[PDB]
Amino acid sequence: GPWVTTDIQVKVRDTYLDTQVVGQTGVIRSVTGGMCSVYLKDSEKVVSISSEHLEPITPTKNNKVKVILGEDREATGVLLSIDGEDGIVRMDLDEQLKILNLRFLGKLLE
Ligand SMILES: [Cl-]
Ligand code: NA
């Protein structure tokens, strides 16, 4: 299913109509029918943007993360380390480490 979810950092792709918004970063704060309300950091404004114009920003070490794909989607944690293509995440619910390919992880900015 979809990857978009609340509170993750995204970049606007070149299928969005407004050239001034293409390439900007923001954070999803709501999702309704495949439209996301994205708070754009540079322009300091919200825009309603179809999910299919977005891409997740890959998290780095010490970012909080929210799983966006697979069985653990919506679970949160902290990215402790990157080993190649895999992230090592301390999961918030049980405090245990879990290995997830980085493509499974959104950067959580609450
Ligand atoms: Cl749109
Ligand atoms: Na969409």
Swiss-Prot record:
PTM (free text): Methylated by PRMT1/HRMT1L2 and PRMT5/SKB1. Methylation negatively regulates interaction with P-TEFb and RNA polymerase II.
Cross-link Glycyl lysine isopeptide (Lys-Gly) (interchain with G-Cter in SUMO2): where in chain: K61
Cellular compartments annotated: Nucleus
Tissue expression summary: Ubiquitously expressed.
Location of Phosphothreonine modifications: T58
Domain of life: Eukaryota
Self-association and partners: Interacts with SUPT4H1 to form DSIF. DSIF interacts with the positive transcription elongation factor b complex (P-TEFb complex), which is composed of CDK9 and cyclin-T (CCNT1 or CCNT2). DSIF interacts with RNA polymerase II (Pol II); forms DNA and RNA clamps that stabilize Pol II elongation complex while maintaining the nontemplate DNA strand in the transcription bubble and nascent RNA in the exit channel. This interaction is reduced by phosphorylation of the C-terminal domain (CTD) of POLR2A by P-TEFb.
Function: Component of the DRB sensitivity-inducing factor complex (DSIF complex), which regulates mRNA processing and transcription elongation by RNA polymerase II. DSIF positively regulates mRNA capping by stimulating the mRNA guanylyltransferase activity of RNGTT/CAP1A. DSIF also acts cooperatively with the negative elongation factor complex (NELF complex) to enhance transcriptional pausing at sites proximal to the promoter. Transcriptional pausing may facilitate the assembly of an elongation competent RNA polymerase II complex.
Family: Belongs to the SPT5 family.
The name this protein goes by in its record: Transcription elongation factor SPT5
